[PDB]
Structures are given as C-alpha cells and as structure tokens.
Design a protein around this ligand. Structure first.
Ligand SMILES: Cc1cc(Cn2c(N3CC4(CNC4)C3)nc3c(-c4c(C)n[nH]c4C)cc(Cl)cc32)cc(C)c1F
Ligand SMILES: Nc1nc2c(ncn2[C@@H]2O[C@H](COP(=O)(O)OP(=O)(O)NP(=O)(O)O)[C@@H](O)[C@H]2O)c(=O)[nH]1
Ligand SMILES: [Mg+2]
Ligand code: NA
Lengths: 469, 167, 166
C-alpha cells in the first residue's frame, strides 16, 4: 500500500488533495491553481522531481508569497516527523530483539529523503539563479545560511556543505569555442584612429559585428527580476529594470543615429550611399541572426523622416530593396515570420525583446491572481507558468555566445553614440523631420541641390569577409 | 469577402492601456488570456448590421522603444488614443501622439478616437469635461472605459470603426 | 521544431554537469557542486533540422540513488557518462544501463556511452574496454572533455540522432 503520512495536525503538507486546495490541468500532473501550501508540497514532491516547476515557481512566486514567508514554509516542509514503531517493532523490542523497522526505513527512504533533498534543491536554485532576494534582504540571507548550516545527518551532508560554499561564493561574486573568431575588418578608418570613426569609414562588416557583440551583451544581461510583475512599466522602472532599459535605449539610439546619418546627408548621391551602407549593415545583421539589429534598421527606414525620401529610394539598387523588404516582412502580421525564423535558426542570436515584453505584460494583465473555488481563494498558478514560459524562452537564447572578437575602440564608439545630444526627444525628432523636408521638399516644391560633405570615397567595400593568411 | 480594419492602440505605458483590447478580444465572460496565441488580436464583429474583422495592434509594454512608434503606427487605418483618467501626464501626452499619427499617415484627418480609461480606484485627476473639450478641439469622439467591468470597451472600438467608415 | 528529452546519468564527479554546461554555455565549471537535479534547454540545428533539446542533469551521489525511476520514465535518450581516470565509475555504468532498461521496459533505449575527462593524461579505463562494452549494448562510444570541448557536441548530438532514428 501507500506509505502512511504524519497527521495533518502536526505536519501541514500531509493534508489530502481536494478541489478546495489544488486544481490540476486536464506524465506528471500540471497544476492550474492551489493554496501556497499545496504549491510548496508539489514543488518538493516525494514521488517525482519537477525542475521546470522549480524554475517557474522561483521566478514568479513573489506575486503571491513574500521571500521571508517562502523560506519559513520550506523549512516547515523540511522538518518531517518520523513515524512511531509499529506493532511488530513493539513485539520485537519487548523480547529484547532489534526491530526490523520496515515501515520507518521505507518512510525515510521514500518520503523524508526525497522531500528533504528536493527542499535543498529549491534552496540551491534559489541561491544560484535568484540571488537578488538575498542581495535585497540581508536578513533573509542570514536565515538561509543558518538553516543550511544547521541541517544534521549524513544523508544530506554533501549537499548541505556544497550549498554553504555556493552561498559564500555568491556573496563575493570564461568562454571556449569550436573555432577561432574571424579577423577584424578595417576600411577607411584604421586601427587606433577613433576620431575618424563614422558610418561610412568603419567597415560595414565590422560595424555589424561590433554592434552584434554589444547588443548580445545587453540582451544577455536582462534578468527575470526585471520582467516579472511588469516592473519595467511602473514608476520604479529605473530601479527594477535597469539592464532592460539600457538595452532598449541602445536600440533607440542606434535607430535615431541611422535616421540622423541619412537626413543630415543633404547631397542626394551621398545620401544614397548612406542608405545603401545601412542596408549592407542590415544584411550582415541577418547573417549573424541579430534580429534586434535587423529591426533597428527597419525601424529607421520606416520612420517618418526617412520613409518619405522618394528620390533616395528611387536610386537604391533592386537587390537592396529586396533585402529591406524581406527584413520588413519579418514584422508583418504581428511578427509572424519573425517568430518562425527565430525558432528555426541556429543560435547564437539576438532576439527582439519587445514581443516578450508585450506578451508578459498582457499575460499579467489579462489573467486573475486568484481563482475562487468552493469558497476558497486559490493561487492562479497557470498564469505564473505562462509568464515563466516567456522568461524561459528569453533565458534559452541568453546562453550561446558569439564567436566574434571585440574591437575595444569600435565598441566604445557605439557605446558612446548620442545622436540626440542635449536635445529632448520631441525637439530632436522634429529636427529630423524638418531636415527631411529640407532635403526633399513636399511636391510641388522643386528638389534643391546640395554640396557634398564627405571627402573620402563613398564606394562600399562590401559585406563579404576577407581572409589573409 | 468582409472588410478588415487595422486598428492601432497608442498611449502612455504603466497605466492599464492593455485592458482595452484584452477585454474586447477576451472570452468576454471568462477572465483569461494567452496573448501568444496566433490571432488573440483578431475579432469578427457586426457593427451597424455589417460584419467585419478587427485586427488590433496593441504594443503595450514597448513604450520605451520610442523610435519604433512610426513603424507600428504606419500599419493602422484608425487609432485609439488612450490615457488613464487618474494620470494627468498620460492625458497631456495625447497631443503629441495625435501629431505623430498625423505625420506618419501624412494626413490632417486620420480616423481616431480619444479614450479615457479607468484602470483602478485611485482618484480621478482628469475630469470628463476636460477630455470632452480636448476631443472637441480635435474633432474626434471621446469614450470612457473601465479596465475592470468592460464598460465602454465595445463603444470605443465600434466608434472608431464608424469613424473609418464615414471618413 | 521537434523536442528531445535527453538525460545525463553516471557516477558522482564524472563531469555530467560540466559536460552539460559546456554544451549550453561554452563554459567549463571548475567547481564540484554535487547536483540534485537541474534542467537546461537548447535550440540547435542538427543535420539541417532545428530542434529543442531538454537536458536533465541528474545526481550521481549514491545518497540520491533511490530517486532515479522518476527521471528515467521521462527521458527519451540517455548519456551514460563515466570518467576515463575512474575505474569505479566505469563499473557503475552497467547499473545505470540495467535500471534504464527496467524502468522503460525496453531493450532498445537510445543511449550513448561517454568517457569523460579525456584531457587528462592519467587514464585508467582503456578505450578498448569501453568500446567493447558499448558494442555489447549496441551503442556508440564517444570520449569527451568538458574542459576542452573535445567530443562534447558529438556526444549530445549523436544521442539526438539515436532518438530520431528510434
Ligand atoms: C529603400 C528605401 C525605403 C524607404 C521606405 N520604404 C519603402 N518605400 C517608401 C515608398 C513609398 N514610395 C516609395 C516605398 N518601402 C519600404 C519597405 C518595403 C519594401 C522595399 N518592399 N516592401 C516593403 C514593405 C520596407 C521598409 Cl522598412 C521601408 C520602406 C525609404 C528610403 C529612403 C529608401 F531608400
Ligand atoms: N579535467 C577535467 N575535469 C573535469 C571534466 N569534467 C568535469 N571535471 C571536473 O570534475 C569535477 C566534477 O564535475 P561535475 O560536472 O560536478 O561532475 P558531476 O558528474 O556532475 N557530479 P554529481 O553527480 O555530484 O552532480 C569538477 O571539479 C569538474 O571541474 C573534464 O572533462 N576534464
Ligand atoms: Mg552534477
Ligand atoms: Na495625475
């Protein structure tokens, strides 16, 4: 038969399942809703491990349970009473013999040790992947250190001593590749001559590579703590979502820089060279699976100041119009082709983050925190699972590093890019649109001519890489 | 077959804007949503006896991608300009959203509605007379909606479709 | 995108976690932090087909030895890892092989035999002995180093191919 359990009066996690405390979705069960006690029981269940539930729960639990309360509950879960001797054990002891203790040994092996190990696995994952709870609450860390440091008994000892060391390392806190990265490419600007760096003087291949390294690093730095609770939209967004906002502000600045490069090139022939170079950068972004970069270019080309430059458009080669068209088509029909492409490529890649943000926000706004059943309020866990499916997808693309060499000066150039200067956003985007009107006036005003501004050759070196010995 | 209308929701973030489309497209009568589901933003409706398909773009959550606004807005035939009735700044933002829509569409007469959204029980700071006066100064309808009871939601979208049909 | 459920099994300390983290992050873990149970995901194109690998990284310490049926039921294919400088870990392989066969009630479970730590000079398990065992199981034998990446992709992606052809 099944193992008997402690009385639910001395150990709360032995209460029977019912629809008043847990609801399953229609080979392990999937939880739709439950009390916090039932969620923690299933988080640390004696019959099976559920590592994706551990991640889901530790990512999302703060919407229904405070960190201090979670720790109290898993300590309570850990402290399992052992059963008393059975009648057969009693009779053995009365005869001066050693009892077999069969039921006690089974309960230790099949209930206590798995539940206790799974509690420790929650602690291990909490410290390793959600350490911000402890960075923000020193007393919580003290409690965790004390709990782990006072677990007795040899069955758990290896993991207790390990988790103690992991905590101490987290308090004070290298890549290998299948091949060598390709050689850094140079065009008009030569190494060390940062003062000449610009859109047309750096090599377009290397512009795309260094922006991809920068944008990959920005993508990889965003933690789930910046996303759950929709905190990047709320009044404290600068406190709670700083890496996400840095990533978005880079994307915005690059889009505006592309627009500024275009409309501040008043000579038509030179402006065609600028737009053609930006489409070449887009081509390399596509080759690198940098979808953030792809959309940075698409957003610039579809902006009000650039979109209307029909005289510039007319001179762009057909093959480049086709590249831009197929990049824009990724975004059509609610990103249908983008989503399919992201799921088909071989990483590394840089996803576009905005879709994830909208899906997390709408999942949190469109589903209730609790379900009411039989007069009880149950935590709606399905809603949290949906959010954690999105954060899990984000994390999956954060693992793979690009095999590209950093160029420190080109990296610094793009880190320090500031197209708006000291101007406010409305000021600056009105300026860009007025420049567009200046360089290609609305019909029927005649098209003026403008002097050249670039003293160096406009011919692109192209985007196929070179390889000397 | 039936006409499809591409509608675009615009407005300040962080103040419950997304509730408007969620409540519309929702299983009206089950409070639940999966936005990742292909066509959680398409809805067949009958407006004044004429069946049509609404395709709604709501990029709620992407407000910091400010250089993408033109890209997103360009797709739309009609616009819901949404502010929160307890957030004066979101109401003051409306003028610039409308100017940006006019520029992207290259038209002084773009179908649009002004929507005042009640997103919580915090005290109202934009009175309905202020919003009516603003809408009248623009020549567009004003609709107030609740983010919790679905009141006004159908009216906001149907009124916009009528603006498109009567353009 | 087909999803594949891979499970990494073997004695404590043979490098199951280091192998997995090398595959997932291109990083070698120097610490020895005994695993309870960890899970990873990886999108990757193998033989021109995109898939999604779900990788379960299991506990090798003997204190967890009674908790294995639950993960063996879920797995589609198993990396059976020993360390080439640890003869006891090689002798433990057959216990994992037999338990997997029992739980899945099958003589034909996708498996790859992995001899890890092949960057170390002081080998105590000869390749021939491991290859003989692999042949008796009908499975390939791949020597790996989580430290240098030697053989790591080959081991995991060979297991995917096994599951695909099952
Ligand atoms: C090359 C180029 C493009 C634009 C602006 N633009 C234009 N053109 C503006 C008109 C209207 N009269 C011309 C068409 N088409 C696009 C496309 C696109 C292409 C291609 N095929 N299909 C699509 C949807 C994609 C994107 Cl993102 C921007 C687009 C502006 C300048 C200065 C350019 F050089
Ligand atoms: N030189 C070398 N050391 C390795 C290699 N793989 C793992 N190690 C080292 O061996 C130790 C144990 O590695 P680990 O991945 O934790 O082993 P495990 O099989 O996951 N242990 P457990 O079963 O307890 O979770 C670590 O110190 C790790 O750096 C390898 O290929 N070469
Ligand atoms: Mg391990
Ligand atoms: Na206000």
């Amino acid at each position: 038969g099944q193992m008997r359990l402690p009385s639910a009066d001395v150990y709360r996690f032995a209460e029977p399942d019912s629809e008043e405390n847990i609801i399953f979705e229609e080979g392990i069960p999937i939880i739709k809703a439950g009390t916090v006690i039932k969620l923690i029981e299933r988080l640390t269940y004696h019959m099976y491990a559920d590592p994706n539930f551990v991640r889901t729960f530790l990512t999302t639990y703060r919407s229904f349970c405070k960190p201090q309360e979670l720790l109290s509950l898993i300590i309570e879960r850990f402290e399992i009473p052992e059963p008393e001797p059975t009648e057969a054990d009693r009779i053995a002891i009365e005869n001066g013999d050693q009892p077999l203790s069969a039921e006690l040994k089974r309960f230790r092996k099949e209930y206590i040790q798995p539940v206790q190990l799974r509690v420790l696995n929650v602690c291990r994952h909490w410290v390793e992947h959600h350490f911000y709870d402890f960075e923000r609450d020193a007393y919580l860390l003290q409690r965790m250190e004390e709990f782990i440091g006072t677990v007795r008994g040899k069955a758990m000892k290896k993991w207790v001593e390990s988790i103690t060391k992991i905590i101490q390392r987290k308090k004070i806190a290298n890549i290998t590749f299948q091949s060598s990265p390709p050689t850094v490419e140079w065009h008009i600007s030569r190494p060390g001559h940062i003062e000449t760096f610009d859109l047309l003087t750096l090599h377009p291949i290397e512009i795309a590579r260094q922006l991809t390294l920068l944008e990959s690093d920005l993508y990889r730095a965003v933690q789930p703590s910046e996303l759950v609770g929709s905190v990047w939209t709320k009044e404290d967004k600068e406190i709670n979502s700083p890496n996400l906002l840095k990533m978005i502000r880079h994307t915005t600045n690059l889009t505006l820089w592309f627009e500024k490069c275009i409309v501040e090139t008043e000579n038509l022939e030179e402006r065609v060279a600028v737009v053609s170079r930006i489409i070449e950068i887009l081509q390399v972004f596509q080759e690198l699976n940098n979808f953030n970069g792809v959309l940075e270019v698409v957003s610039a080309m579809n902006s009000s100041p650039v979109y209307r430059l029909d005289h510039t458009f007319e001179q762009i080669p057909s093959r480049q119009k086709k590249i831009l068209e197929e990049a824009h088509e990724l975004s059509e029909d609610h990103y249908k082709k983008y989503l399919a492409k992201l799921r088909s490529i071989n990483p590394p890649c840089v996803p576009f983050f905005g879709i994830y943000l909208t899906n997390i926000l709408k999942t949190e706004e469109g589903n209730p925190e609790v379900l009411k059943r039989h007069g009880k309020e149950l935590i709606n866990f399905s809603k949290r699972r949906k959010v954690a499916e999105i954060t899990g997808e984000i994390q999956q693309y954060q693992n793979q590093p690009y095999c590209l060499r950093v160029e420190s000066d080109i990296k610094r150039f793009f880190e320090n890019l500031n197209p708006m200067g000291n101007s406010m956003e409305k000021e600056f985007t009105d300026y860009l649109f007025n420049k567009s009107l200046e360089i290609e006036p609305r019909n029927p005003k005649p098209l003026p001519r403008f002097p050249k501004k670039y003293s160096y050759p406009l011919k692109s070196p192209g985007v196929r890489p070179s390889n000397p010995r | 077959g039936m006409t499809e209308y591409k509608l675009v929701v615009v407005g300040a973030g962080g103040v419950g804007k997304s509730a408007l489309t969620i409540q519309l497209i929702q299983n009206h009568f089950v409070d639940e949503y999966d936005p990742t589901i292909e066509d959680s933003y398409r809805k067949q409706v009958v407006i004044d006896g004429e069946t049509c398909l609404l395709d709604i773009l709501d990029t709620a959550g992407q407000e910091e991608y400010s250089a993408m606004r033109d890209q997103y807005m360009r797709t739309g035939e009609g616009f819901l300009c949404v502010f929160a009735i307890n957030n004066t700044k979101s109401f003051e933002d409306i003028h610039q959203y409308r100017e940006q829509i006019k520029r992207v569409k290259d038209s002084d007469d773009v179908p649009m509605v002004l929507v005042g959204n009640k997103c919580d029980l915090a005290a109202r700071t934009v009175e309905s007379r202020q919003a009516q006066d603003l809408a009248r100064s623009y020549g567009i309808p004003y609709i107030e909606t609740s983010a919790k009871t679905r009141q006004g939601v159908e009216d906001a979208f149907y009124t916009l479709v009528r603006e498109i049909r009567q353009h």
